[model samples]
Target: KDAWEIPRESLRLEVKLGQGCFGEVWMGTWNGTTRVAIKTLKPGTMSPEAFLQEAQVMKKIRHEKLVQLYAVVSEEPIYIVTEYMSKGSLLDFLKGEMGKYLRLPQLVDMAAQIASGMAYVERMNYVHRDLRAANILVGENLVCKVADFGFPIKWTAPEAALYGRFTIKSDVWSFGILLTELTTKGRVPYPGMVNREVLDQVERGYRMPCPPECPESLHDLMCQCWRKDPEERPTFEYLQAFLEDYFTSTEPQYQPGENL
Candidate 1:
């Protein structure tokens, strides 16, 4: 047993937020204080060995912009407790009322924060495998944190998609897709295309078009991330540095789209 191992009895599960075959997310509290999010796994969802290894990997990483894994209850149904983000997933936030008011700087700031977190992930020699708006969580003050980290076609790099390879550079490609999601305010990448279509086209050098009202510079940065050769893509540290400066610049820029 480790310090990070929490007793299941110590938690009081409250209202459920989301549910699926694996398990559900609940608004919970530890010892009846400290609001938290409990992501549970059904007894058979994962093997005990796999769950513990995943928990161990998650517990060791800590960053302000990365979701804090408070503790874990490794019982029949595992409960992984984390700091609750009141505003929910960035994907939901981008499609909701708050998203309607986002300005160019704010959107860029969001990217900056995510990039900062990813940079830290990179420094740790970790590859997110999945870096998209859906995996990014939003909390108070519109702060974004990189949360439970995957590989799916649309967000995967060409090499990772075709050859089952993954690396920091593959994560870079997904981050670009995330930027597209942020800029479009939540439009799925490749909008109308099917996954197979996206894969074939992407393999043939097709990249997504600039999102509506997205700054050309920002889109250009996204293009750099989508370079055919993963080595040609910008590192997360560079992306963070560039975006932080870009967001603070006072020069005129294209206004992002607004709710009608």
Candidate 2:
């Protein structure tokens, strides 16, 4: 009875755009007025509890830097309708096509927007378990918002395994990774290196050197974000102030090439 109850036609599902281990994402329209991204659980794996958890999280938070949930359909096959980010994820933009010509200030602006959104989440005591570039969406006017939290529930302390538990510090770690990815124009964080190897390097006080054209101040800030000990990392509040100062003092003419 549950399987037959889902109204497939109501959402007007379009062609499938991408698929992950858990589900598939599709570009769709609801009521022919609003464009939305619909992600449906794989058949036979749909669980009401999971749907409720995601819905609860989405409904509880409202921030300009976070993705908005439009609706959730959970009769049999669960579906999530969210605000469509036309420019796609930050990774797609940085690695796909427009990366070469992106100036440093533009990248800083994007990072600032991300920090603004993330600061709100940090204040609310919610940690985004996954905060990589792929999870960050670029919207109209080059606005960036954090998206995707399907990995695990929020946690307050670090766990033995990084998957199940997420802390504010964990989000900060992911933010550092995003910064690294952006600085390298979407290049792999540590080419040909495994996770443990990278973590070891980080633990030993090693950081990815500043890219050819990246500013030294910006590079230092990014390295600070990646400090091995979470306590050593700067808070989003500090980061916001630093970015604001950099943008204002430079008269918005700071480009990555000039720093190189």
Candidate 3:
């Protein structure tokens, strides 16, 4: 069954690209020449209000490092059109699908790109509540941009309600999770742990172990971001500057090789 029915002339659904927890994504042609990715929300699942919130937030955001939303077609079924990334997500790139060779410096560069993109979003008062490798897309020419904003929420103070509450600090927490994913070459944040187990552990000040090969400084930064107190987490702006300095000062010749 068709989850969404778009205007036959407005967009041509080319193929089913992939599926996620929310719904299926389709490769489509918009206005004939322009290629786009269309996400159709699962029926009887996500509330229309939530979907509208996501679409509205996306409409307000425009940055080189953030995916561009072309349009929203919300009729019988919800549809979102975004710029397509030919090279797929960062997770796929980490798995070596996009290219054969990637140096340590290139990995560092990817982290910096992610940080810069996140910093921009933070500045705009949007918290990417679910930042991870799969949420970041790598385009042609190694261009990276943050995507998949289905879980985005407005930044708020700590005293706010717990459910949908988020902040730049919370985004930093998500960034730490992304850092762990990148360092482990795309391993899940908490492989076998349930939400309660992870939350209990987190409350007790437990943290996921940094991959053995990850640099000490980088690991420390990641740990700092995952602190129990959100106030302890550094802003994405600080993270970007820190990574820039770390990448610039370190010698590019040092490679992790098979150790990673």
Candidate 4:
């Protein structure tokens, strides 16, 4: 309903945030005032449909825990503008210098926020084919928001690769992997296992065992999400509630695991 097209001239691109083969994200401003993150695609490198689909999905969604879309540039080199999260990706935040600084409750808080966002998405009857620490953004006061829908083979559900299918249940499976990432401070989901090995093992009912640092309750919740049958996985709404309750009971304990 709001204006989706923003004049390219009025937008100011600042520092480059990150880059990929066909696109780059930038820390930028709109009208030289509003701070934003701009995602731009190289001309003809990606079809407009693929690039703009995120914007299209975002336009219909509005939630505090989800990244808010500001506007987009409709020209050749398109830009999808979204609200800025100062602390950057949850992946880097976990693996970076804050490894020793964060407590268990803080980590649960981040998970709860993401769960809340995803719950809203689920209620909207939409599937976030991608839900991982990398697709999440962190801001001041440990605020986390669901940013983009993208995925990795390691974070995928077993059925997804088998049938090229994805649903909220698959996202639930990915969320379990993300919990492993948070607990292990960004360790790879299946350490010491190659992708091929992981694929075979996962197909044979081998979900990752609990990490030493993660609580038993949280690990049990993760297992629920990893259920082989998609129908057996808990809903995002249930996940959000579980995390919020878990966060309240979590003590501020600092148990430093071996570095990633």
Lowest summed lDDT over 10 consecutive residues: which window, candidate 3? 152-161
Q: Which ten residues in a row have the lowest lDDT in candidate 1?
A: 251-260
Tens digit per residue, CA lDDT, model 1, 1-260 = 77888777889899799988777899888888799998888777767667566567877798999998888877677888889999999999999989888777888888999999999999999988878988899999989999876237899999998887899999999999998888888888897898889988998899888776666778899999999899999999999999988945533544445631
In candidate 1, position 102 carries an lDDT of: 79
- What's model 2's overall lDDT? 0.72
lDDT tens digits, residue span 42-129, model 4: 9878988778877888888999999999998767688888999998999999989976677667788889999999999899888887
Model 1, residue 59: distance off in Å is 1.9
Taken over the whole model, the C-alpha lDDT of each candidate is 0.85, 0.72, 0.73, 0.85
* Reference-based TM-score, model 4: 0.92
Off by over 4 Å in 2: 1-9, 151-165, 250-260
The residue pairs found clashing in candidate 3 are none
- How would you order the candidates by TM-score, starting with the best? 1, 4, 2, 3
List model 3 lDDT by residue over 44-63, tens digit each: 87777777567777777888
lDDT, candidate 2, 61-161, per-residue tens? 88888898887776657788888888888989888777877777777778888888888888998777777887888878878898885521111112413
Query: In candidate 4, where is summed lDDT lowest over 10 consecutive residues?
Result: 251-260
